[PDB]
Amino acid sequence: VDSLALKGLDLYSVGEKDDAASYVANAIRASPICCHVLGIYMRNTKEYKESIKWFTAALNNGSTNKQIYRDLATLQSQIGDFKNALVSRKKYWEAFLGYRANWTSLAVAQDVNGERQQAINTLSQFEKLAEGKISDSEKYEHSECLMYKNDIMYKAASDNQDKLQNVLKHLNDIEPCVFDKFGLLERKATIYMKLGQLKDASIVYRTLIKRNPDNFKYYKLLEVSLGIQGDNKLKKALYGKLEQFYPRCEPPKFIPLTFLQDKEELSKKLREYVLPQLERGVPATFSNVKPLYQRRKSKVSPLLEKIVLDYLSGLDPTQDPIPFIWTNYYLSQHFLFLKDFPKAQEYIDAALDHTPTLVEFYILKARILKHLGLMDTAAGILEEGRQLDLQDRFINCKTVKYFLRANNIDKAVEVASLFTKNDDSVNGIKDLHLVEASWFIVEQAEAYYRLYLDRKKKLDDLASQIANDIKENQWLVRKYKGLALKRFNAIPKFYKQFEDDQLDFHSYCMRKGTPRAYLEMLEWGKALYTKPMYVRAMKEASKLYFQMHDDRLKRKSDSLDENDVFGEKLIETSTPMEDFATEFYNNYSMQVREDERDYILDFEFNYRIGKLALCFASLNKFAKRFGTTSGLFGSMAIVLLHATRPFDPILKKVVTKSLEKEYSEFDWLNFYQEKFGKNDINGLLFLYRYRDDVPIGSSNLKEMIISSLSPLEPHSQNEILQYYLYPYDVPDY
Template structure:
């Protein structure tokens, strides 16, 4: 072994021991003597991904550094050199793969793992890492082959069989998956120990799921019956799971008699599962027979007296006097018990306007007959919720005030009053009312979070964050924000971002008033501070919106370790559920809301570019500040740092503001790339997409989003009304584009297409 190889091994050992500074010094020595040594280029790239000598983050020689774009570019260049001087070198390819896996570029990592394995097929561990990358990429076709190759190389571990079976399952090769599971069963027969109980149980029920997916319903039923009868020590312990699968298979086979028996067993095990009741009705074939359903639920109510569902569900199909009679019976007992969630239970009945009238009639009758004032207060609370549901807020307020007059310390009543005030657009009063409720129980986290939310909605940002800090660690000072980001409390970060967004627009509007009206008191206005506030609120709003997407990216990346770990624990069904969850992660309504907010904010900055440019121009006010203005500005900045600081760098998001003002939408584009995959066609996602396409100058594509919004607007519902308002706003934005003068022939052609499209709506 020559000196270069000895030095390289030494550098590799230092890297593995996290002595990054020493390792990079050794690599530099190698490259100085031998500039064609490909492994050293790859190792240097990998080390640089952890430690960079010129990074200001590195206060410690072995401290991890943040891989920014400049460092990433440097590492990419080093890996290009490694490929150039050793295109078939398995070591440099493996090191390159490790780097790209570290920076979460799984496609490039998979490429280099494949290269490394092709040139060193004896290193089977590469296949395991390649499989994890392919799983993260959702490349299931290649994954099934790779998992099988690794299983062939390492047949002594049950986890390898499980992972191969899952790979076939994900690639819709159910028969191959079943064969692998059967191989496991044959291999572990008579060799199981107590620690294998859970894993073996999961494997057995997973096999039943595979039969069901493959359409082998008769086989599934037969196998499940055998498992249910089994008294063996290593049987399937998830009896409910087996019964549910058996029911589904029997329904597919149209064996309703047997399915009825199965669903009865499930109800006996869990009478609080609403799906079981609907399945029972379906098995009996009495969906349209009201009388038989009524008799059925009377019996079920006697069988399961502690369950609320058999008593409630008749309300969903009864009508007229039958409905009124049963509702009276249902409400009476719950009013006497003072159940706060009663109205939530029957809220679904309000889809029928006739039933909503009967509900009020029954409640008022019970109220007039009730002599116990405590029970009466709960009835008044219920009636208040009824009026609230119908958006009759004045009547709702009247009834909840009556309830509060009887029970002034009931937190539920006080909270509901705050909710009514919120819908009356009295946001400050609502926040104060919610705070009054909070003061009744200072140990209650839920009421504290509700108060924080209401304070943020009322734009009382500083007060809201102080209240949030009552239940956070606050190790880095008075602000709870760092801790809230660490625990990934997306609900408060989103509300906080929206409050900052509103504050930015409000301050910008105030600046516009000063500029437009040339107020006589302008000299008394600290305009320089106002400009600082505009920039800070804009930057912080952008920063907080982006931080939510950063958190969701972490959620998505958290899958990676489970592509290996889940099979060691035998959690096959849980792994499949995780894959399904991850595929829908960016389709959640919450993400749609934040996506829409972010795109709307950036588009607003484009629409108001001239005004915003003036507001961010400090040259006109910098030298006009008085001593009082400067002191006021210093005090404001100290308060902002004290409460709003999360990141050491770019504390107020100034760099984000500069990027947006320079029309650098790279961060926005990366978010669009993630969200655009299987994007749901909801009001918020469509509006966010519309604003993004407008930002990109893709007006015809934006027009297509408008057409989809118009389709939703045809619905006779609250969603339809919201879609219509959003569509009107979209049309206004497109009309503004049409009215903007231009000398560009291409833009003029686009205008003609857009104008024609608007006429055809």
């Protein structure tokens, strides 16, 4: 009984995971030790909720082991149950009073539960206990708890002047024992500002600047404290002075560039900023002034064009090679940004002609040729650049994308598989998220996705030696699709691991004494599944998952009468929607802010799993931000209305009665063209994905879509159709 449990933990502790599980699984069908063992096992296997239940049970069965409360506080913190972690922290504190860690962790739990005064008192009581000249190895932790206490008093103070004045006296008292001086000074200045004590603040901002004169943020806060934020004459004089204190730093040189209006003065400061960078051969020179092109294009462009063309005209190409090539490089970017591509090419060619060993020049020239519509030449140039550094991930990916745009399939495949030549692994590592960064992986997912669509079309054409070719292609279609899905699926693993890495810190930060950093970690962990790269991977993978679902239903209707290294298993799934949810979508949806929530995604996800009242909620919330005349809105509503006619009966009713209050707002396309117009590309694309459902006239729909793309270059239009219409035209297999 207890034996079966400990048998499992042993088994897991060895590595026989499957046998461990059955041993534990039927052990369930008790002892304090038994509950403890299972709590441990469930933690080890990331069943934190289950682990918490079993730990609580160990106690409720007369466990004498007080270390269980520490296990609980950790687990409860990890899953976000801070109400119960507080109880655990209090219990553990009572049994192990002699360690400051347990005081700090109790205070942190009180703070998180909104018990700020209690948290303050907890910290203050230990503070008093530790007046007896704290030893050198305890001074760091002590400094951190003093500042943490000030954090809590600062928050509680809000805008109250008396309270703020007290937070400041406390701040001043603790200063000699606080070693986080940046932290303390930044807090001091903020308080000063909130007290209306601007001269005091400016002194602190000047102190922060002198400690790090390369931090733009201190300079902007200084301006506000001096009350000259709108004063060009005084700002000019201020930065001129700060430039004499800090002549090697960018903010005094750069900030006047954002506000000066006098042409001669601005020209001079632009010259002083840019020309020394060109003369040093700084590759980033243009990137450094790009924000000026972005925010002051018409004013700064002509000035810098003149400034840098003049500078160039004075350079000897042979005896001033470094200024010459990096000045030509700047001018190439300058005219590229201005969308003058022939001139951009001239300047990059001059740099390349002089010095062909620099990768930067191939990268820039390939981009310029892309803009000139010369896709094979652009890919060729980038490929030359790739020979200069064959292990660079950025250029490897970019080269693949360019050959794909040039429809050079063989070269794309060759370059794409360079780092993964053996067993789809990089240097013995199967799981790419353990060795490559997320961008390399998503770029590969996209490239394979595109390689997959290419084979997909070749198959369609073969359908209309040959049986061998079809066999070759059917096989490449599976391989490229699997690789795309496998690449996308590596991404969530990055972020799952980060979330789970938190676990040891719920106690380690307490022991190290970094409660402020700990709280930032908690906010961070609550946002992991909303990062740009995570969201990008999720939405791009979603089309593979939606299509495995959609195409299976298609093939099913089609045959109604009829008688691992490349991710093959992933693409044969019969639960693609559940796979998307567990691997990508649930964690994102659990964390995303409502003002960041993508309601088109939510609608289309819940549509395919039948949850038609979530569909309605998504449609409604969408309108509340984007209007009821938006093409996308009309499209979702139409599809939802049709759904109320294959879905659950007792819920088609619910939606209908929920839709009863859209009564004011049969050929459904013509209704669409008349109530919403034919200009909303996203609205048209949405109809296209459900056109055989509504139904929606596909020929007329495609024409509207193609009209709305009339603006774009012909080759580009093709690529749009391939990505946005094709996959919904013909089912895989």
